[PDB]
């Protein structure tokens, strides 16, 4: 029952450190870097919505449109944002709406290379006159190849 | 044992 | 004078009845319970449960009202300075007409007591059905499921941040149906308290002893406060009961004052040590005397409005079966020391 | 029934384990049914105190004590074949052995409770002469005592007692068997005139 | 200095109360369990569960907080170019008002504390709450947290069925089967009613080293106690072990009770009667001892 010198026990001083503001949405790497097969803005937003588990229309209406200051964005975010859907081609265009979509996606996700996702780099060398399809264009063979190889469909 | 009643404590009295 | 102001002799009988029904007396049991409860209130420090046990007529309700008003008057400068801050909240647990306790009803009524006495403030809960209205009555839709209401309650109780949530008649928690456990009904409140950082003080009769010690966690973060009656074995509480009887006699707005301490045995036989029953009986006899313009309270008036013998036996056996378990002795610490291995 | 027992425990401050044994004895069937053996007239006796049948191994050793306890006021209850007690005792050699033993009766009185074992003369003498540290005689109170039984009683807040058949007054037994029929009745009402007649005849002549 | 700062005496009493709140004692059991937890976090070694048990008040929650902070401050040199990366997700289990656990409620509370938007508009992409579980799964696979702690893990134990008690934790296996995220379940001894198994042991009375450690932590508490006069508390350690059951958390909260009582009385030292005014009752302590001994036996099975 001998008692030695009672060594005082140290402290811990728990304190949660702060971290830089986490992005509202997920931050996936947009496939096609260094490849002539870079993906698209509509494909990227649809992939973001699917990963989040929400419909892309719902993501545009409830997460993007209020963050856009334009009057029609806010108004159509509550009666069906059909304006942004009937003209989904211009989301990939050279113009102001494409740049606004890139800016809002950057704000939501906090990336650094979403300008390469579109060809907005060439807003001074191209022209949207008879350039973009009104309807979707997909390669089924690439879709299966990527699905069967385990990679993401983009 | 065999054939022996369990050691029950039998109540008494006429109901 | 320590008695009633005599000017009510000309005032109508309603004022005399109001005086006798609004007079409060202070006695050492109530003061000890008050001080202990307020000291626990000032800091729970991990403890998330307060069980205020009492008897039938000791006055748990008046204690809870006094405490609520006390922290109300304490926070009144802070309530005026800062809004969206309710100091304490109170609710009476509903006795269910169904066989089981209605958790949904408890949640919606708790939200009613926490929201309704507040001006139309734009605070949004993380739920859809519950919302405000033009008249100011926040309404819970009948289609809202119970856990959504509980989440709304959690958000409201972390935003408002009260000190204590009082659940009066808490024994109605034990009104559980089918084959649940009486402990399954308290882990929910334990989770509520441990998530919202909120002390929950439960008040009830001796039956609330069924939740007393159910789990290790349910007993570590819990304290028990006993509203002891006026016993008969110990003469000092007998003298205290005589003092309260003398005070009640002195504050009786009668024409001529009778002596109420000579019938002390007969008074205690129909009160069993509970002050509230005595107050209630005295209010009855006062009303009877005042209706006939009587100048005094006689023993006939006392006997005509006394409690029944069978009732008194009932409550007394309830009290006995209650506080028989509620007894802490030297053996209770001796055997703990022995079993711990310290000896 | 439970409240009065609880107040009894509180008044006598019986320990938690002692209260556990008393509760077990109160609510339990007898451990073993009494066997006929080879030399003992056995059987059962109706007791209005308990209100049940109580089993005796010997009708002239245990049964007199049962009669006393049934007509004794100090006794509240008297169970038979209480659960076995592992009496620990050192024999003549020195080895401390633990032997299972069943007391004849378990008596709960108005101020104490414990075990009571009924034996005879010659049995007590042979057990004492064959086991020095299991039975001995105290001439002060003139009582037989068992070391492990009383030790277990003292470790539990209870008592232990050995009832022999030297101390039983057989005249008392005969008179109890005489008046047991009137004891078992419940509404004994003697006519007032006849009672007064006997009272007068008795007070007019002492020692009749 | 090894003692509490001597400049907080002129400060108001609430400052002393806050200082006692923030103060924590790192006794060798805490540091060894912390080392074990950090080692098993750094190398699961084919283990996806870090089950942790211990009676209430032993200090599991504080260990979890310390582990969370240390993981965050170790991953900090990588949270400047990387976003959507929480180092730790911690959750508290919901005690059901229904007969059985609400897995949908658990999922939605998880998404509430994972900063996942659009919970109420989750759509099932082709068994309880499809959209909610697939949202959970993903979230965590994209967020990639190091460990996912769940407090009050024993709250998973109410299913009121002997054939479903081991069929109630399977959702956690599925969540941990396709995300690669560690799971550190913390709870009371009821978590034995169910992987790396850890025991949050106390300091036992029988062993001498545990008694010495208890004396040392009590001395640290009495030296860092914010009073003008240093109170002698080792001479009451036995009493301090009677209403505590060796759980440093219960002793800490009770000592803070005494501290605030003295601060409201302007007492320069704590006395035995101050301890006796806020002392925990006896029946609750007996229940504590029974529960902790039952848990220790149940874990003692080999
Ligand atoms: N010390 C007291 N001073 C003044 N009034 C008291 C006191 N104790 C009780 N009363 C009064 O007694 C009356 C009835 O008792 P009360 O309803 O408060 O009891 P309770 O313990 O809450 O019991 P229950 O809710 O089970 O009926 C109330 O009007 C209350 O104001
Ligand atoms: N090492 C410590 N130093 C200081 N305070 C501590 C320490 N360990 C626990 N506490 C105190 O214990 C409380 C936190 O609860 P604690 O971690 O002890 O319980 P737990 O056993 O993890 O959980 P539960 O009791 O809910 O089962 C706080 O009051 C905290 O100050
Ligand atoms: Mg009331
Ligand atoms: Mg904890
Ligand atoms: Zn292709």
How many residues are given for chain E?
Answer: 302
User: CA of E146: how far to CAs of D181, E68, E116, E179, in Å?
Assistant: 88, 10, 18, 11
Which residue from D67, D77, D73 is spatially nearest to D27, judged by alpha carbons?
Answer: D77
Strands D113-118 and D136-138: unpaired
D145 within 8 A of D135, measured Cβ to Cβ: yes
Ligand 2 centroid–CA E272 distance in Å is: 23
The residues, any chain, with a CB within 8 Å of residue C202's CB and separated by 6 or more, are: C49, C50, C51, C52, C167, C170, C173, C208, C211
Distance CA(C129)–CA(C148), nearest Å, equals: 9
The residues, any chain, with a CB within 8 Å of residue A146's CB and separated by 6 or more, are: A152, A153, A154
C112 within 8 A of C128, measured Cβ to Cβ: no
E184 bridge partner residues: E149
**In the block, which residue shows the tokens 């799971």?**
E183
Answer whether D15 sits within 8 Å of C331, measured CB to CB: yes
Which residue from C102, C68, C277, C274 is spatially nearest to C172, judged by alpha carbons?
Answer: C102
Helical (H) or strand (E) element with C104: helix C103-115
This structure's resolution (Å) is 3.7
**In the block, which residue shows the tokens 């995220």?**
E181
D102 class by beta-carbon count within 10 Å (0-12 exposed, 13-18 middle, 19+ buried): middle
Which residue from C233, C212, C225 is spatially nearest to C320, judged by alpha carbons?
Answer: C233
In the stretch 13-32 of chain D, residues with CB closer than 8 A to chain C read 15-16
Using CB atoms, list chains with 3+ pairs below 8 Å to chain A. Answer: E
Phi, psi of C70 (to 5 degrees): -70, -50
B12 min Cα distance to partner chain D (Å): 5
User: CA of C152: how far to CAs of C85, C107, C110, C112, C155, in Å?
Assistant: 16, 9, 11, 12, 5
First-last CA distance in chain C: 59
Q: What technique solved it?
A: cryo-EM
A14 within 8 A of E24, measured Cβ to Cβ: yes
Distance CA(C335)–CA(E282), nearest Å, equals: 10
Distance CA(E86)–CA(E72), nearest Å, equals: 8
Whether the CA torsion A68, A73, A79, A84 is positive or negative: it is negative
DSSP class per residue in D22-40 = HHHHHSS--SSPPP-TTT-
Distance CA(E292)–CA(E298), nearest Å, equals: 10
In chain B, the residue whose alpha carbon lies closest to the alpha carbon of D33 is B7
DSSP class per residue in C152-174 = HHHHHHHHS--SEEEEETGGGGG
Residue A142 marked ligand-binding: yes
Residues E154, E156, E157, CA angle at the centre, nearest 5°? Answer: 70
For residue C276, give both structure tokens: 């509230």
D108 bridge partner residues: D77, D113
Which residue from D98, D94, D62, D100 is spatially nearest to D80, judged by alpha carbons?
Answer: D62
D144 within 8 A of D135, measured Cβ to Cβ: yes
Strands D113-118 and D159-163: parallel
Which residue from E105, E84, E81 is spatially nearest to E93, judged by alpha carbons?
Answer: E105
A128 within 8 A of A118, measured Cβ to Cβ: no
Residues A114, A119, A124, CA angle at the centre, nearest 5°? Answer: 125
Helical (H) or strand (E) element with C13: helix C13-22
For residue D106, give both structure tokens: 């378990």
Helical (H) or strand (E) element with A97: helix A96-109
E150 min Cα distance to partner chain A (Å): 18
Helices of type H across chain E: 13-22, 28-42, 60-75, 103-112, 130-143, 170-175, 208-223, 237-242, 248-265, 272-277, 282-300
Distance CA(A17)–CA(A26), nearest Å, equals: 22
Distance CA(C94)–CA(C105), nearest Å, equals: 8
Distance CA(D78)–CA(D73), nearest Å, equals: 12
Contacts made by residues E254-257, CB under 8 angstroms, sequence distance 24+ = E254/E278, E254/E279, E254/E280, E255/E20, E255/E221, E255/E225, E256/C43, E256/C45, E256/E17, E256/E20, E256/E21, E257/C43, E257/C45
Residues D144, D149, D152, CA angle at the centre, nearest 5°? Answer: 145
In chain E, the residue whose alpha carbon lies closest to the alpha carbon of C336 is E286
Which amino acid residue places its CA nearest to atom 4 of ligand 2? E24
Which residue from B6, B8, B5 is spatially nearest to D28, judged by alpha carbons?
Answer: B8
List of chain A residues whose C-beta atoms are within 8 Å of the C-beta of residue E2: 8
Ligand 2 in reach of E24 Cβ (< 6 A): yes
Helical (H) or strand (E) element with A71: helix A71-76
E231 within 8 A of E247, measured Cβ to Cβ: no
For residue C222, give both structure tokens: 């819990």
Which residue from C212, C118, C209, C188 is spatially nearest to C159, judged by alpha carbons?
Answer: C118
DSSP class per residue in C232-248 = SSSHHHHHHHHHHHHHH
The residues, any chain, with a CB within 8 Å of residue A40's CB and separated by 6 or more, are: A92, A117, A118
Phi, psi of C97 (to 5 degrees): -75, -30
Helical (H) or strand (E) element with E150: strand E147-151
Strands D43-47 and D52-56: antiparallel
In the stretch 50-79 of chain E, residues with CB closer than 8 A to chain A read 62, 65-66, 68-69, 72-73, 76, 79
Which residue from E157, E149, E189 is spatially nearest to E50, judged by alpha carbons?
Answer: E149
The residues, any chain, with a CB within 8 Å of residue D163's CB and separated by 6 or more, are: D62, D65, D104, D116, D117, D118, D119
3-class SS letters over E225-250 = CCCCCCCCCHHHHHHHHHCCCCCHHH
Ligand 1 centroid–CA C218 distance in Å is: 28
User: CA of C168: how far to CAs of C65, C154, C185, C200, D134, in Å?
Assistant: 10, 20, 16, 11, 62
How many residues are given for chain B?
Answer: 15
The C-alpha torsion from D166 through D167 and D172 to D177, rounded to 10°, is -60
Which residue from E214, E257, E258, E256 is spatially nearest to E21, judged by alpha carbons?
Answer: E256
First-last CA distance in chain B: 31
Chain-centroid distance, C-alpha E41: 17
- A9, A17, A21, A61: which to substitute to probe chain E, counting the most E Cβ within 10 Å? A9
Question: Does C122 contact chain D (CB < 8 Å)?
Answer: no
Which residue from E108, E131, E114, E128 is spatially nearest to E170, judged by alpha carbons?
Answer: E128
* Closest by Cβ to D33, choosing from B4, B11, B13: B4
Distance CA(E221)–CA(A67), nearest Å, equals: 52
Helix (H, G, I), strand (E, B) or coil at E24: coil
Helical (H) or strand (E) element with D124: helix D121-130
E95 min Cα distance to partner chain C (Å): 5
For residue C15, give both structure tokens: 């004022």
Helical (H) or strand (E) element with C50: strand C49-53
Question: Does D191 contact chain C (CB < 8 Å)?
Answer: no
Rg (CA), chain D: 20
D163 min Cα distance to partner chain B (Å): 23
- Sheet of C199-204: strands edge to edge? C88-92, C164-168, C199-204, C49-53, C223-226
Helix (H, G, I), strand (E, B) or coil at C103: helix
Q: With DSSP H G I counted as helix, E B as strand and the rest as coil, what are the percentages for chain A, rounded to 5?
A: 40, 0, 60
DSSP class per residue in D45-59 = EEETTTTEEEEES-T
Strands C199-204 and C164-168: parallel
User: CA of E38: how far to CAs of A26, D86, E92, E141, E184, in Å?
Assistant: 28, 53, 21, 21, 11
Helical (H) or strand (E) element with D117: strand D113-118
User: CA of E180: how far to CAs of A103, E104, E147, E156, E176, in Å?
Assistant: 33, 22, 10, 21, 6
Answer whether E69 sits within 8 Å of A8, measured CB to CB: no
Which residue from E114, E123, E79, E175 is spatially nearest to A25, judged by alpha carbons?
Answer: E114
In chain C, the residue whose alpha carbon lies closest to the alpha carbon of D2 is C321
Which residue from D52, D45, D2 is spatially nearest to D23, judged by alpha carbons?
Answer: D2
CB atoms within 10 A of CB C136: 11
D64 within 8 A of D166, measured Cβ to Cβ: no
Distance CA(C234)–CA(C105), nearest Å, equals: 44
List of chain A residues whose C-beta atoms are within 8 Å of the C-beta of residue E131: 53
DSSP class per residue in C106-157 = HHHHHHHHHHTTS-------S-SS-B--TTS--B--TT--HHHHHHHHHHHH
In chain E, the residue whose alpha carbon lies closest to the alpha carbon of A60 is E118
In the stretch 83-102 of chain E, residues with CB closer than 8 A to chain A read 83-87
For residue E28, give both structure tokens: 């060798």
Answer whether C195 sits within 8 Å of E257, measured CB to CB: no
């Amino acid at each position: 029952m001998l008692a030695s010198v009672l060594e005082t026990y140290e402290s811990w001083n728990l304190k949660k450190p702060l971290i830089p503001q986490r992005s509202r949405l997920y931050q996936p790497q947009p496939v096609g870097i260094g490849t002539p097969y870079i993906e698209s803005l509509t494909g990227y937003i649809t992939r973001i919505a699917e990963l989040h588990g929400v419909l892309p229309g719902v993501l545009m209406t409830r997460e993007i449109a209020p963050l856009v200051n334009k009057i029609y964005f806010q108004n159509g975010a509550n009666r069906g944002f059909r304006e942004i859907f009937n003209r989904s081609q211009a989301l990939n265009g050279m113009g102001e709406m494409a740049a606004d979509l890139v800016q809002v996606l950057q704000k939501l996700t906090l990336r650094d290379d979403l300008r390469f996702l579109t060809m907005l780099f060439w807003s001074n060398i191209l022209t949207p006159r008879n350039l973009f399809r009104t309807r979707k264009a997909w390669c089924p063979i690439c879709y299966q190849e990527r699905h069967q190889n385990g990679l993401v469909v983009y | 044992k065999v054939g022996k009643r369990k050691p029950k404590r039998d109540p008494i009295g006429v109901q | 004078s320590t008695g009633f102001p005599l000017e009510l002799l000309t005032r109508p009988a309603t004022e005399r009845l109001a005086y006798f029904e609004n007079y409060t007396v202070a006695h050492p049991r109530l003061k000890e319970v008050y001080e202990i409860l307020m000291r626990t209130i000032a800091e729970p420090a991990g403890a998330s449960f307060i069980f205020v046990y009492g008897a039938s007529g000791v006055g748990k309700t008046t204690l809870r009202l006094r405490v609520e008003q006390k922290l109300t008057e304490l926070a009144l400068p802070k309530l005026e300075s800062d809004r969206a801050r309710v100091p304490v909240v109170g609710i009476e647990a509903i006795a269910p007409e169904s066989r089981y306790f209605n958790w949904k009803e408890y949640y919606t009524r708790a939200l009613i007591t926490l929201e309704e006495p507040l001006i139309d403030h734009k605070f949004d809960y993380g739920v859809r059905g519950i919302s405000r209205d033009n008249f100011g009555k926040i309404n819970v839709e009948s289609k809202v499921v119970a856990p959504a209401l509980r989440r709304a309650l959690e958000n409201a109780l972390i935003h408002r941040h009260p000190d204590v949530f009082f659940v009066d008649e808490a024994q109605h928690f034990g009104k559980v149906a089918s084959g649940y456990k009486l402990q399954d009904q308290l882990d929910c409140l334990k989770s509520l308290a441990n998530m919202t950082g909120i002390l929950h003080c439960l008040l009830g009769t001796y039956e609330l002893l069924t939740f007393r010690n159910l789990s290790g966690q349910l007993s570590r973060r819990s304290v028990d406060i006993h509203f002891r009656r006026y016993c008969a074995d110990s003469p000092e509480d007998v003298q205290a009961f005589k003092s309260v009887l003398l005070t009640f006699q002195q504050h009786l707005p009668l024409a001529e004052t009778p002596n109420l301490v000579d019938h002390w045995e007969y008074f205690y036989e129909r009160t069993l040590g509970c002050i509230g029953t005595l107050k209630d009986w005295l209010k009855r006899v006062l009303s009877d005397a005042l209706d006939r313009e009587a100048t005094t309270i006689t023993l006939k008036d006392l006997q005509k409005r006394a409690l029944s013998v069978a009732q008194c036996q009932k409550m007394f056996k309830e009290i006995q079966e209650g506080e028989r378990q509620l007894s802490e002795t030297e053996a209770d610490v001796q055997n703990l020391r022995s079993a711990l291995g310290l000896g | 029934m439970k409240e009065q027992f609880e107040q009894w425990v509180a008044r006598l401050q019986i320990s938690e384990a002692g209260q556990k044994i008393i509760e077990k004895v109160r609510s339990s069937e007898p451990s073993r049914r009494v066997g006929g053996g080879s030399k003992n007239v056995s059987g059962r006796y109706p007791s209005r105190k308990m209100g049940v049948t109580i089993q005796f191994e010997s009708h002239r050793v245990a049964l007199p004590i049962i009669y006393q306890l049934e007509h004794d006021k100090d006794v509240l209850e008297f169970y038979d074949q209480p659960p076995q007690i592992k009496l620990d005792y050192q024999a003549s050699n020195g080895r401390r052995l633990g032997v299972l033993h069943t007391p004849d009766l378990f008596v709960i009185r108005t101020n104490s409770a414990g075990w009571e074992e009924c034996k005879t003369e010659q049995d007590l003498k042979k057990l004492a002469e064959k086991n020095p540290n299991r039975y001995f005689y105290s001439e002060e109170n003139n009582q037989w005592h068992s070391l492990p039984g009383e030790v277990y009683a003292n470790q539990f807040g209870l008592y232990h007692r050995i009832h022999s058949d030297r101390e039983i007054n057989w005249v008392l037994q005969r008179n109890l068997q005489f008046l047991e029929d009137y004891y078992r009745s419940e509404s004994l009402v003697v006519e007032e005139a006849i009672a007064q007649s006997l009272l007068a005849i008795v007070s007019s002549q002492p020692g009749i």
